[PDB]
Design an enzyme around this catalytic site. Structure first.
Site, PDB file in Angstrom:
ATOM      1  N   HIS A   1      29.654  48.349  30.359  1.00 42.72           N
ATOM      2  CA  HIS A   1      28.547  48.101  29.443  1.00 42.72           C
ATOM      3  C   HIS A   1      28.208  49.149  28.397  1.00 42.72           C
ATOM      4  O   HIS A   1      27.901  48.799  27.256  1.00 42.72           O
ATOM      5  CB  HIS A   1      27.290  47.755  30.243  1.00 42.72           C
TER       6      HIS A   1
ATOM      7  N   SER B   1      33.682  46.194  25.855  1.00 47.57           N
ATOM      8  CA  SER B   1      35.094  45.912  26.044  1.00 47.57           C
ATOM      9  C   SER B   1      35.887  46.428  24.864  1.00 47.57           C
ATOM     10  O   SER B   1      35.347  46.688  23.783  1.00 47.57           O
ATOM     11  CB  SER B   1      35.335  44.402  26.136  1.00 47.57           C
TER      12      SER B   1
ATOM     13  N   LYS C   1      34.069  30.081  26.752  1.00 48.48           N
ATOM     14  CA  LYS C   1      35.490  30.389  26.768  1.00 48.48           C
ATOM     15  C   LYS C   1      35.899  30.715  28.208  1.00 48.48           C
ATOM     16  O   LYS C   1      36.975  30.306  28.661  1.00 48.48           O
ATOM     17  CB  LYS C   1      35.814  31.554  25.837  1.00 48.48           C
ATOM     18  N   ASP C   2      35.019  31.416  28.933  1.00 52.73           N
ATOM     19  CA  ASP C   2      35.265  31.789  30.336  1.00 52.73           C
ATOM     20  C   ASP C   2      35.300  30.535  31.207  1.00 52.73           C
ATOM     21  O   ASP C   2      36.000  30.488  32.216  1.00 52.73           O
ATOM     22  CB  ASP C   2      34.180  32.742  30.870  1.00 52.73           C
TER      23      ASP C   2
ATOM     24  N   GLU D   1      51.968  40.149  54.076  1.00 50.91           N
ATOM     25  CA  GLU D   1      51.427  39.175  53.139  1.00 50.91           C
ATOM     26  C   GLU D   1      52.019  39.511  51.755  1.00 50.91           C
ATOM     27  O   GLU D   1      52.120  40.683  51.375  1.00 50.91           O
ATOM     28  CB  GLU D   1      49.889  39.244  53.122  1.00 50.91           C
TER      29      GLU D   1
END
Ligand SMILES: CCCCCCCCCCC(=O)OC[C@H](COP(=O)(O)OC[C@H](O)COP(=O)(O)OC[C@@H](COC(=O)CC)OC(=O)CCC)OC(=O)CCC
Ligand SMILES: CCCCCCCCCCC(=O)OC[C@H](COP(=O)(O)OC[C@H](O)COP(=O)(O)OC[C@@H](COC(=O)CC)OC(=O)CCC)OC(=O)CCC
Ligand SMILES: CCCCCCCCCCCCCCCCCC(=O)OC[C@H](COP(=O)(O)OCCN)OC(=O)CCCCCCCCCCCCC
Ligand SMILES: CCCCCCCCCCCCCCCCCC(=O)OC[C@H](COP(=O)(O)OCCN)OC(=O)CCCCCCCCCCCCC
Ligand code: HEM
Ligand code: HEM
Ligand code: HEM
Ligand code: HEM
Ligand code: HEM
Ligand SMILES: CCCCCCCCCCCCCCC(=O)O[C@H](COC(=O)CCCCCCCCCCCC)COP(=O)(O)O
Ligand SMILES: CCCCCCCCCCCCCCCCCC(=O)O[C@H](COC(=O)CCCCCC)COP(=O)(O)OCCN
Ligand SMILES: CCCCCCCCCCCCCC(=O)O[C@H](COC(=O)CCCCCCCCCCC)COP(=O)(O)O
Ligand SMILES: C/C=C(C)/C=C/C=C/[C@H](OC)[C@@H](C)[C@@H](OC)[C@@H](C)CCc1oc2c(O)c(OC)cc(OC)c2c(=O)c1C
Ligand SMILES: C/C=C(C)/C=C/C=C/[C@H](OC)[C@@H](C)[C@@H](OC)[C@@H](C)CCc1oc2c(O)c(OC)cc(OC)c2c(=O)c1C
Ligand SMILES: OC[C@H]1O[C@@](CO)(O[C@H]2O[C@H](CO)[C@@H](O)[C@H](O)[C@H]2O)[C@@H](O)[C@@H]1O
EC number: 7.1.1.8
Lengths: 55, 62, 385, 125, 246, 93, 385
Positions: G202, G206, G228-229, G272
């Site tokens: 924050h 970004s 968009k997300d 795994e």
């Protein structure tokens, strides 16, 4: 108090010493308490009774 | 009243017999509180950690 | 600037615990919050470590708590700390809430602070309930039974909700296993709620015993209050230690040392002490539905205080009539608890009904009437005409 | 409760000889028991200020009285934190316990009331 | 609630373990086990108590090993899959007298003798109640009280009517250490043993309590002194007002 | 950083109070004060000050409730004794 | 001021989800973060609900998961969502990390952001491990044994730590029960770290695919990036649903459908899929201690990137050599995973050792050499002097 000055001289006790003292205190304090506690309860503990029961 | 005339702190101040009287007492008090807190913290951490060690009922050496 | 102020993480610690401007005159009653934080941590830490040796299956639940008591190194310390810790958690929360009542902490601009607090109280009680069930003693079974059934009072869907909560035909295996799952969950929600509590506390800061602005004389949290809180931290620990090692069971019920039995409700059944007043309130209403409503309303009425207090000043410090009724309320609360511990018998029933009315009348009648009277008294006691 | 409301009820009692002889004594007793004067505060210093009316009033209060109020408040927090009371010769006397802020509060309240009425006036065509 | 329903309040006897600094009397614990084995075991289980816990408390490793080996337990089945028994060991729990609840009730007129591993903590009164119950059976119930066929009167029991009959009688046991086995002496001894069964951590709990309370008491006083020092400047702070010139 | 709402409290340098003028304050270093002996000089002497000033506001309601409890507790005791079964049959059902 | 900005709680939602100024050019790769948030919520919710029917007892664990699979309404959906959800969580996390390496998201002023991320990665892996142990299949038991034994490499106190983690002589009841308790605990710790992650994100915002400042053209989080997300959320749910309903066990191991057996490690044992690359690294070292150190260093070396990237520009967008070597890294990671699933045999052992070397050489040798070279290429390729 001069008793304090002779060891630390106007400085506060440092962490290292504090920690080091804590380690000494644990051992000594435990022994003293167990010792007092067991003595206050003499005759009642199992180790005391085991000595009695000999036949 | 003039700001240059400092009020009376006599009952609070100590006679300059040993300027370090308060300091030493204060430092011993802090030092002991830290010593015992450290012993207490170590004992607490050990109490929890030790509760994760093999319980009394699984130490059977059959 | 200092790293404690510029760093993204430390600045949070700095604003809440270091440079935070506290009213120079807040007394020891303001130490209860830090104490509740300690309680939550104590409860969570001890719970997790016990969780490592516990089994939720209704057949292994009780014995696994016995396994923690006997086989786990320091296990009895973990359990007594947890159990007695829960009690201290409530005694401290009661004092914290009472402090709020007495000093008008609920008044604007701290209404949200108070409301989130009411949320925390409810979650805390539900958490305590769920935890007690996990022991699976006689009190656990019947407590789970009575409390889940509280929802059967909801018209129409009532009984379905209860079957859904139980996961069967009665409190059984699926009930204890989900209750333990839920008991683990809520403490984390409370923590989340505590953060919200502190966020509301922070934008307005704490109030003070005088009830007036603290803006003219603040002293930093660090040192003054960090050390003042330490005083109560140690006294809290000392007293909790006295109970944990020397009288670990005086606050509980011996019936919870008997495994739950679905066919027998002990005649000696009594709720946990901290739930007694609410228990007494419900027991005072000779109607199932009205009984649960009133009991739940007993908690929710705490929300009306910001509006029923008509006083032009915050807090009871300079108000004779308010101070007197505040103690009537407190003592009425203790009596409600004592009534709860008695049987449903003649003198006690009427007393409970009367005490229940006094409880609600304080928020809805006494507070608004007395505060209005005091406003006028302060006025005519000085102004000439 | 608004001060306008408090004043309305208070004036009414204060003007009535019957009520005035009955209530005022009880009120005087109440104020002495309240004990704020022993802390060096005047009643008007006790009014919760975190609301627009009080902020308006405190803004309008003349400089000199404002500095005086600040002192009484600071001196009180200090006295209270030491768990003492001020020496008697520093207690606010009844003559000094004057409603200095009250007129500013009543003025602010009347203005807001009018503004509220004007914001909600109905029209009759 | 009527007196009968409440049950008679149990008086406070001077248990040598009553007190912040007192451990249990281990000789009394050892004697109590004998009373349990010879008088109670036939009807009452002690399911949460493992043999190995008696070692170092009331008996030696050998004594417990021998006591345990007198009982059989289900062993792992043979190579063919057939069930087999084995002598008990230190890891086993003191065996109960009945295979199930049904067998227990049958041997007790429908009544079920509760497991005693927690009896001291599972009843209001603790040791005082257990002791008072065991030594509180009168020769006959009070006048006017009709007793249900199969019941026994005991004032300390809520209701007064209890399914267990008096079982402690003078010298029904012969203590190994030569102690006169009177009813009250035996009552005192088993109750002490039952308290140990319920709270085996007792002795160790109190010892740590002494340590914890001395440290915290010290910590508490220390914190007060320290607090007063850090607040000394604020506590004595002086203020003076000189009305500013307009 | 986004604009958040105004409150009645700010921070160091702009706390939110009125302007202060004419008040002078003085203080002395804790290091220069008598090594704390005010625990048993002005604390035990000034003790019971907070007591005798406030105790009535607590004692009267405490006493009122204690009396009400003891009174009702004794009435219950009587109601459940032999001497009270007559009044018990009445007041109960 | 709008209530969303003025309110104490909504203002946080508004600054992170509504008015947050996002760089206008961020592409779909910047959608992984929100997807990871979705993953955490999916894991926590499905986990809590299953926890309501689970029994951590080693004698009851496996059967309790079977009980969820057969007897619990929609219980197979919970388990398949939780199980497959774990793999998706890791696939999305790998892409999130890769996105970072590629666009230089790790460099100043976002190193704190990256370091917290590395912390979260470790915590998630430990969580997934603890979870796998709770099923108590054949893979569960042996995984628990190997992984706890990883600590026996610590000199002197080594075997002691293992005994302490086990709570006995071998992976047994005390181990499975504590592992369930810790499995429930870590996800909340991860949630807390995610908050610290978002806090660090924050203050700097970004980055973008161009690797340059986004301050000259920002668009609000709301509508634009909220919707968009949503695109990737639905895609993520579509693909996950495909596995949950049509191929629930493709990403798993059949051996874990067999109850744990303390006396038999299946010859078909394989870790795994998401742990294979790290497993391959450990196997590549013919020394016990060095093996575990190298494997752990494989995660820690991610912390070195901010210093070994000597480039004067952020991101690989305009860098031919860096773009190329970045993919060598990606496929080398995938290969390391493939070697992981193979037996310790001739061709594979050498391939794993060389691939392991390439893995470390990327961060310590390739990146610094290539970035330096490109710095000089950008300069002499235009500057005429
Ligand atoms: C069952 C579960 C219980 C768990 C809860 C345990 C914690 C309890 C908290 C107690 C509390 O909140 O009481 C607050 C009131 C208000 O007090 P005040 O007006 O702010 O204080 C003025 C000080 O003397 C200033 O004095 P001081 O210089 O700061 O030292 C004060 C005193 C503080 O002692 C404490 O620990 C506080 C309770 O230290 C001593 O001199 C004691 C030496 C033995 O203190 C009292 O009046 C106590 C009576 C209610
Ligand atoms: C794997 C198992 C678990 C993971 C499940 C979740 C999968 C999500 C992760 C995939 C991802 O992040 O891919 C990102 C790339 C980069 O893309 P870009 O450069 O920013 O896009 C320009 C857009 O077309 C603009 O166009 P648009 O107007 O936004 O529509 C875009 C496109 C988006 O499709 C998606 O679902 C996004 C991946 O919709 C379509 O028209 C096609 C529908 C199939 O998207 C790609 O095209 C991939 C290229 C290799
Ligand atoms: C759901 C709603 C729940 C709420 C229920 C209430 C919780 C239950 C009550 C538990 C204890 C709370 C006691 C009251 C809370 C503290 C009160 C308080 O803040 O008192 C301040 C007061 C004196 O302080 P002042 O600042 O007003 O002094 C004037 C200086 N110029 O200090 C005093 O007057 C002295 C304090 C006397 C305390 C005695 C308390 C009696 C409590 C019974 C204990 C319960 C055990 C059975
Ligand atoms: C502990 C170590 C953690 C690291 C582990 C890494 C594991 C690998 C992660 C798996 C998926 C790899 C994701 C690739 C990384 C991000 C890719 C990327 O960002 O590509 C951007 C590139 C072109 O993008 P530009 O922004 O430069 O375009 C500018 C236009 N002027 O567009 C392209 O290059 C085209 C897209 C390439 C698709 C990726 C293919 C690789 C797929 C792996 C298959 C998985 C096998 C099971
Ligand atoms: C887990 C429980 C809780 C925690 C950790 C907590 C913590 C705190 C803290 C740290 C403070 C500041 C210092 C203090 O005044 O003690 C505070 C203040 C406050 N809390 Fe709580 N609280 C909790 C529950 C509650 C509840 C249940 C209520 C109300 C029903 C409440 C009401 C308040 C109020 C009104 C204040 C402001 C007091 C004032 O400044 O006058 N809190 N709390
Ligand atoms: C706000 C925190 C908590 C509260 C108020 C709380 C309260 C309680 C209560 C009242 C009991 C029954 C006590 C008894 O009589 O034995 C209990 C039991 C239990 N709690 Fe909690 N608890 C809290 C947090 C936790 C946490 C986080 C866990 C899980 C990790 C946990 C695990 C358990 C367990 C294992 C029991 C059973 C053992 C016992 O009886 O003490 N508790 N809890
Ligand atoms: C000195 C050895 C014994 C001890 C210490 C002992 C102790 C106790 C105790 C404490 C209770 C619990 C009563 C309650 O609910 O408060 C009880 C109940 C009972 N005991 Fe024993 N007992 C002993 C021997 C026996 C014997 C030999 C038998 C079997 C013939 C027996 C049969 C019962 C039964 C049937 C009850 C049920 C009481 C009821 O619910 O009415 N007990 N005993
Ligand atoms: C549960 C784990 C995680 C969650 C929920 C999370 C969430 C987010 C979110 C919401 C963003 C912003 C949008 C985006 O870039 O996708 C972000 C950015 C970022 N995260 Fe994470 N993250 C997680 C783990 C990690 C890990 C494991 C790393 C690295 C080892 C990491 C590195 C980064 C970086 C460097 C950015 C900034 C990218 C840029 O703006 O260029 N995160 N993350
Ligand atoms: C947020 C991260 C989480 C991750 C990455 C995760 C991952 C896993 C994994 C890998 C398994 C094994 C799946 C299988 O093969 O069967 C598992 C099982 C399990 N997890 Fe989680 N988990 C998470 C959170 C939680 C939470 C919060 C709980 C709550 C108690 C939980 C409860 C369970 C349970 C009960 C199982 C056993 C049943 C099953 O096999 O699905 N998990 N988890
Ligand atoms: C969730 C909340 C739980 C607890 C809330 C209580 C808040 C008080 C925390 C105490 C931290 C004290 C640090 C002082 C410091 O850093 O100042 C340092 C000095 O620290 C010391 O002298 C050490 C004294 C020993 C501290 C005692 C430890 C407390 C025991 C912990 C119990 C709490 C659970 C700055 O000193 P200086 O200002 O003179 O240069
Ligand atoms: C681990 C936690 C991470 C950080 C937590 C913060 C994240 C915030 C997410 C929560 C979003 C929900 C916010 C809804 C609250 C908005 C309304 C509001 O605050 O009204 C409040 C009153 O709220 C309440 O009484 C209840 C609080 C709700 C508790 C929700 C669980 C009014 O407050 P107001 O801002 O209007 O104050 C000025 C007016 N004089
Ligand atoms: C996580 C907080 C839990 C602590 C709650 C404290 C309530 C009182 C009971 C404490 C007993 C626990 C251990 C014990 O029995 O030790 C006892 C000693 O206890 C003390 O000294 C307690 C004082 C507490 C100081 C704690 C400092 C703060 C904790 C920091 C943790 C990092 C016995 O010690 P021992 O096992 O003999 O070595
Ligand atoms: C899955 C989660 C669920 C179902 C949560 C439910 C939460 C319910 C409420 O919390 C919000 C509830 C705990 C709270 O009511 C407001 C308490 C004051 C309830 C008080 C309460 O206790 C009793 C108790 O403890 C008993 O013990 C043996 C026995 C009881 O009767 C015989 C009661 C009882 O009659 C009441 C009213
Ligand atoms: C109480 C909590 C504890 C003790 C947590 C410990 C956490 C440790 C690490 O997490 C940080 C660890 C999980 C992480 O190492 C970095 C993994 C990459 C380990 C990878 C890993 O997996 C295996 C596995 O899954 C198996 O399954 C059947 C079997 C395995 O061998 C046959 C392995 C194996 O040989 C390795 C190296
Ligand atoms: O189980 C004992 C048996 O005794 C009876 C005989 O009538 O009751 C009397 O004798 C008991 C044993 O001495 C007393 O406990 C009892 O109080 C007394 O009335 C039966 O009623 C009882 O079943």
């Amino acid at each position: 108090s001069s008793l304090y000055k002779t060891f630390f001289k106007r400085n506060a006790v440092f962490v290292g010493t504090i920690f080091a003292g804590a380690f000494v205190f644990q051992t000594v304090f435990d022994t003293a308490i167990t010792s007092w506690y067991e003595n206050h309860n003499k005759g009642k503990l199992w180790k005391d009774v085991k000595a009695r029961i000999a036949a | 009243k003039s700001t240059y005339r400092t009020p009376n702190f006599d009952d609070v101040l100590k006679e300059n017999n040993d300027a370090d009287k308060g300091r030493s007492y204060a430092y011993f008090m802090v030092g002991a509180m830290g010593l015992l807190s450290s012993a207490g913290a170590k004992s607490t951490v050990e109490t929890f950690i030790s509760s994760m060690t093999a319980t009394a009922d699984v130490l059977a050496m059959a | 600037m200092a790293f404690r102020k510029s760093n993204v993480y430390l600045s949070l610690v700095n604003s809440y615990i270091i440079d935070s401007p506290q009213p120079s005159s807040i007394n020891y009653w303001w130490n209860m919050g830090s104490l509740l934080g300690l309680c939550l941590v104590i409860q969570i830490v001890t719970g997790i470590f016990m969780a490592m040796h516990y089994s939720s299956n209704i057949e292994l639940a009780f014995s696994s708590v016995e396994h923690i008591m006997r086989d786990v190194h320091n296990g009895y310390i973990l359990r007594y700390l947890h159990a007695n810790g829960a009690s201290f958690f409530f005694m401290v929360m009661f004092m914290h809430m009472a402090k709020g009542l007495y000093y008008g902490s609920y008044r604007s601009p701290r209404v949200t602070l108070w409301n989130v607090g009411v949320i925390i109280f409810i979650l805390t009680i539900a958490t305590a309930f769920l935890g007690y069930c996990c022991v699976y003693g006689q009190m656990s079974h019947w407590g789970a039974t009575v409390i889940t059934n509280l929802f059967s009072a909801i018209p129409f869907v009532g009984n379905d909700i209860v079957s859904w909560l139980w996961g069967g035909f009665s409190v059984s295996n699926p009930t204890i296993q989900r209750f333990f799952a839920l008991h683990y969950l809520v403490p984390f929600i409370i923590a989340a709620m505590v953060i919200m509590h502190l966020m509301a506390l922070h934008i307005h800061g704490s109030s003070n015993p005088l009830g007036i602005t603290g803006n003219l004389d603040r002293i930093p949290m660090h040192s003054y209050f960090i050390f003042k809180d330490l005083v109560t931290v140690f006294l809290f620990m000392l007293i909790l230690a006295l109970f944990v090692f020397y009288s670990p069971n005086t606050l509980g019920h011996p019936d919870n040392y008997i495994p739950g039995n679905p066919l027998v409700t002990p005649a000696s059944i009594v709720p946990e002490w901290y739930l007694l007043p609410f228990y007494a309130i419900l027991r005072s209403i000779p109607d199932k539905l009205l009984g649960v409503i009133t009991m739940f309303a007993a908690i929710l009425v705490l929300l009306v205080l910001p509006f029923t207090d008509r006083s032009v000043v915050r807090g009871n410090t300079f108000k004779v009539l308010s101070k007197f009724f505040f103690f009537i309320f407190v003592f009425n609360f203790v009596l409600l608890g004592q009534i709860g511990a008695c049987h449903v018998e003649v003198p006690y029933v009427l007393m409970g009904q009367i005490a229940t009315f006094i409880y609600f009348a304080y928020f809805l009648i006494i507070v608004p009437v007395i505060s209005t009277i005091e406003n006028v008294l302060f006025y005519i006691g000085r102004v000439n005409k | 409760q608004s001060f306008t409301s408090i004043a309305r009820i208070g004036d009414y009692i204060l003007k009535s000889p019957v009520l005035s002889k009955l209530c005022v004594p009880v009120a005087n007793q109440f104020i002495n028991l309240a004990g704020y004067k022993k802390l060096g505060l005047k009643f008007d210093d006790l009014i919760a200020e975190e609301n627009p009316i009080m902020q308006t009033a405190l803004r309008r209060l003349p400089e000199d009285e404002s500095y005086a109020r600040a002192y009484r408040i600071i001196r009180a927090h200090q006295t209270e934190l030491t768990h003492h009371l001020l020496p008697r010769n520093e207690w606010i006397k009844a003559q000094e316990d004057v409603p200095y802020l009250l007129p500013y509060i009543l003025e602010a309240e009347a203005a807001a009331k009018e503004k509220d009425e004007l914001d909600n006036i109905e029209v009759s065509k | 609630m009527t007196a009968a329903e409440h049950g008679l309040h149990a008086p406070a006897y001077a248990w040598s373990h009553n007190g912040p600094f007192e451990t249990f009397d281990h000789a009394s614990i050892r004697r109590g086990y004998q009373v349990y084995r010879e008088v109670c075991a036939a009807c009452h289980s002690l399911d949460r108590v493992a043999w190995r816990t008696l070692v170092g408390v009331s008996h030696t490793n050998e004594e417990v090993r021998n006591m345990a080996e007198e009982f059989e337990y289900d062993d792992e089945p043979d190579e063919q899959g057939n069930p087999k028994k084995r002598p008990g060991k230190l890891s086993d729990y003191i065996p109960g007298p009945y295979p199930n609840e049904q067998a227990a009730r049958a041997a007790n007129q429908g009544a079920l003798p509760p497991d005693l591993s927690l009896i001291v903590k599972a009843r209001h009164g603790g040791c005082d109640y257990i002791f008072s119950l065991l030594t509180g059976y009168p020769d006959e119930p009070p006048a006017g009280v009709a007793l249900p066929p199969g019941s026994n009167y005991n004032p300390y029991f809520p209701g007064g009517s209890i399914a267990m009959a008096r079982v402690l009688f003078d010298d029904m046991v012969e203590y190994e250490d030569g102690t006169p086995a009177t009813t009250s002496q035996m009552a005192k001894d088993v109750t002490t043993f039952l308290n140990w069964c319920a709270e085996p951590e007792h002795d160790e709990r109190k010892r740590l309590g002494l340590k914890t309370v001395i440290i915290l008491s010290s910590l508490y006083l220390l914190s007060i002194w320290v607090k007063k020092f850090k607040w000394a400047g604020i506590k004595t702070r002086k203020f003076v007002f000189n009305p500013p010139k307009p | 950083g986004p604009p958040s709402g105004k409150t009645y409290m700010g921070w160091w340098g702009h706390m939110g109070g009125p302007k202060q003028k004419g008040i002078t304050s003085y203080a002395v270093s804790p290091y220069a004060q008598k090594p704390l002996q005010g625990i048993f000089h002005n604390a035990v002497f000034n003790s019971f000050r907070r007591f005798k000033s406030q105790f009535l506001y607590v004692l009267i309601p405490a006493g009122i409730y204690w009396y009400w409890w003891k009174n009702g507790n004794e009435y219950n005791e009587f109601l459940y004794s032999k001497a009270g079964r007559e009044e018990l049959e009445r007041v109960n059902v």
